[PDB]
Amino acid sequence: MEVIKKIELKERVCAKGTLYSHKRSKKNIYPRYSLITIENVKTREAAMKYVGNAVELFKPESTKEESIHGIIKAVHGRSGAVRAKFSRNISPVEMGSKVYIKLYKMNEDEI
Amino acid sequence: AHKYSCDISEATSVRSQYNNIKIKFKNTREVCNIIKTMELNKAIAYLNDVLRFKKCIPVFRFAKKCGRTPQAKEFGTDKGKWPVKSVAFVKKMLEDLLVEAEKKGLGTSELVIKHIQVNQAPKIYGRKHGAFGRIKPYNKSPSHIEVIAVKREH
Amino acid sequence: QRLNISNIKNYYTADDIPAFAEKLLELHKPAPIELRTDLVQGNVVVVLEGEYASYRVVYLSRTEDNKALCMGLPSINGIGLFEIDERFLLRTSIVLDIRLDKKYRAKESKRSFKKFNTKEKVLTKEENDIEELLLKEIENEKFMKKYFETPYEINNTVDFYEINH
Amino acid sequence: MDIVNPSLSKVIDIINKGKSKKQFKRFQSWRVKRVSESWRKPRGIDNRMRRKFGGAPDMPGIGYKKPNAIRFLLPNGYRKIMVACVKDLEALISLNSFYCAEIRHAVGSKKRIEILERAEELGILVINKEGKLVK
RNA sequence: AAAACAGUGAAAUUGUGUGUGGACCCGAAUGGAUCGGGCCCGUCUUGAAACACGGACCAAGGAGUGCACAUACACU
Ligand SMILES: [K+]
Ligand SMILES: [K+]
Ligand SMILES: [K+]
Ligand SMILES: [K+]
Ligand SMILES: [K+]
Ligand SMILES: [K+]
Ligand SMILES: [K+]
Ligand SMILES: [K+]
Ligand SMILES: [K+]
Ligand SMILES: [Mg+2]
Ligand SMILES: [Mg+2]
Ligand SMILES: [Mg+2]
Ligand SMILES: [Mg+2]
Ligand SMILES: [Mg+2]
Ligand SMILES: [Mg+2]
C-alpha cells in the first residue's frame, strides 16, 4: 500500500510542524498566508535559518490531490513561529494538521 | 392522448389515468404516498383493512392537529386516519389494473406499483352567508390521478 | 465603408497589441536558479526526494544545468544510476577517490511518483563497470559496506541546523 | 473549437486566467422575486450599501475597468465582427490579423453554405462555423 | 359591466423524480467537520434595527406635459 510507504519515506527525512492559524488581526483574516510552529525551534534567531525552505501538506484521504506544496516566507513574532504560502488557500477544516519541512530551498515562483 | 409524467416501456407495464374526479386532493395524496413501491396484491389487501377500521393511513405532510392512534406504530409514527371515500376510489382503480394485466398476458403476480401521482384540478365555486350581511367562499377541491405498475425482473 | 466595420471595429487600434504582449511575457518569465559549488566528485550524499529518498549514494557529475548524476550500489543497496535536481541532495563530509572515464546519462527521479519499482531490475555494462570501481574503494574500509545499507534518519529531539554532516 | 490568434499564442492563458468573475447583483434581489438582478444604484437615506459599511457588497465603478489593450478580446485572442452577407466578409480582408467573423442568427442554411465557402478562400476565421449546419 | 384568434403559452403557486442544505447575502476554501464580516427595506427627521408609519405573493397599467407673453444662453 503506497500511502503507508510514502509516509515512512517522509518521516525519515523532514522536520515536523503544525498549522494553527491564518494571518489575522483582532477582526479580519488574510487567508493567503498561514502560520506554522516547528518542533524544537524557539527563538526568532533560530527560526531565521528556515526562511526559504519548502513545505508539504500530505493528505491521503483526499480524492482530488494527495499533496499541496508551499514555501516559508518570513519569521512571525519572538518565539520561533513562521509564515508560509501554498499553491492553494488552506481551508479552516485543515487547521491543527501536521506539516513537513523539507530541508532544501526553492524560489517563490515554483511553489 | 396523455403524457404520463415519467418514461417506462409499454411492454411489461400497465397504466391508467383519470381527470377531475371529485375526491378531495389533500386526502388522496396521503393515501397514494403509502402504497408506492408496494406489490399490487399487498396493496389491495391493505386497503380492504382500512375500510374495516382494522388498519390506518399514516399522515406526514397534511397532518396538523390530527389524532394519535395505535395502528400508526406499523409505520413508526403516532398519527393516522381513515379516509373512506378516497380509499374506495383507489381500490377500484387498482383492481381494474389486474384485469388489464391478466388480459395483456403478464402474470397476476410480481407486479409492483412503480409510479403514482396526484395533481390539483380547478376549483368548483360555492358560497355561505355570514353575520353582519357578509358572504364568504365555500369551494370544492377535486383531483387528477395517474398509476403505472411494472413486472419485477427478480 | 460597410456599416459593420465603421462601428464595431472602431473600439481599438489592435495594431498596438504586439508591444503589450512582449512586456507581459517579460514580467511573468521565471527567475534564475543558481548552480551550487559545494559538491566534489565522489562526495557521498543523501537523497531527499522521490522513490529513492533516505538512501546514501555517490555523486558523479553535473549534467544539464541543475541536473546531477548519481550512483547507488546495485549489490549493496540495489539503487542503480540516475539523475536528479542538485538541490534534492544533502551533503556529507565523506569523499571517495573515484574518477570516471566518460560521460553517461540516465532517467530522471521526479518529485511526484505513483508506484514503486519492486521488480524488473537489470544492469548495463556501464552500471557494472562503475559499481566494480566504487566497490574497490568500499571493500577496504571498516564498516563502510553496512553504512550504505541502513537508511538515514533525522534526529527528532534537536533542531536540524545544530547537527553536523 | 481549439484555435488561437498566432500573435498572442504564448500569452493567451495568462490573459484568460487574469479575467475577473465578479458579479454586481442589485441589492436585496435575493430577498424578493419582484426585484431583478440588473444593477441599479441605491439612493435611500439609511441604505447600508450606499454608505459603504464593512460587510455590505461592493458597488461598480471606474477602478474595475480593464486595460485598453486586453478589452473586448474573445478567449481565442480575436475581436468579433457581425456578418449577414457575402459582401460583408470583403470588409475584413485588411483586418484578418486581429478580427474574426460571427454570422448573425437569422441567416438560414442555404445562405450559410455560401458564406463559409467564401470564408475558406479569403482566409477568414468564422466562430459559429458548425452552427445549425451540423445535420 | 365583462367577454377577440377553438395561435404562442411567462411569473406567482402545486405534485413526482434527482441532487444540495437548515433564514439568507458578501469574502476564502476542504475528502470532511466550516472560518471571518454583515440588524429590514422605503420615508419624514438633530437622530431609525427600532416598542415610529407603509409593505402577504406575482403579472400588467401607473406621475414635470401642451399653448400664450416677456427673458438669458448655444446654434443659423
Ligand atoms: K406544501
Ligand atoms: K462576468
Ligand atoms: K438618516
Ligand atoms: K484598474
Ligand atoms: K388564445
Ligand atoms: K394553448
Ligand atoms: K414618512
Ligand atoms: K425602543
Ligand atoms: K404619519
Ligand atoms: Mg385533533
Ligand atoms: Mg353563521
Ligand atoms: Mg341582512
Ligand atoms: Mg422627534
Ligand atoms: Mg401593514
Ligand atoms: Mg410596466
Sheet architecture: strand order including C89-95: C81-85, C67-71, C56-64, C43-47, C89-95
Contacts of D134 (CB under 8 A, 6+ apart): none
Confirm or deny that B3 is annotated as ligand binding: no
Cα(A21)–Cα(B22) distance, rounded to whole angstroms? Answer: 65
CA–CA separation, B33 vs B26, rounded Å?
Answer: 11
Smallest CA–CA distance from C1 into chain D, residue: D91
Find residue C90's DSSP bridge partners: C46
Contact B82, B56 (CB under 8 A): yes
Nearest alpha carbon to residue A60 among A16, A5, A15: A5
Q: What is the DSSP string of B32-78?
A: HHHHTT-BHHHHHHHHHHHHTTSS-EE-SSS-TTPPB-GGGGGGT-S
Chain C residues whose beta carbon lies within 8 Å of the beta carbon of residue A1? none
- Chain C residue at shortest CA distance from D82: C4
Q: What are phi and psi of A46, to 5 degrees?
A: -65, -40
* Bridge partners, residue A58, by sequence: A67
Cβ distance B147 to B115 under 8 Å?
A: yes
Rounded CA-CA distance D76/D55 in Å is 37
d(CA B75, CA A53): 63
The letter for the amino acid at C48 is L
User: Taking CB atoms and an 8 Å limit, are A103 and C158 in contact across chains?
Assistant: no
How is residue B72 written as a grid cell?
Answer: 400508526
What distance in Å separates the CA atoms of residue D34 and residue D135, rounded to the nearest whole number? 42
Is nucleic acid strand E under 7 Å from A95's C-beta? yes
CA angle at C154 for the pair C42 and C141, rounded to the nearest 5°: 35
Instruction: Name the residue closest to E38, CA to C1'.
Output: D55
Can you tell me whether residue A101 is helix, strand or coil?
A: strand
Separation between Cα atoms, residue A110 and residue A55, nearest integer Å = 12
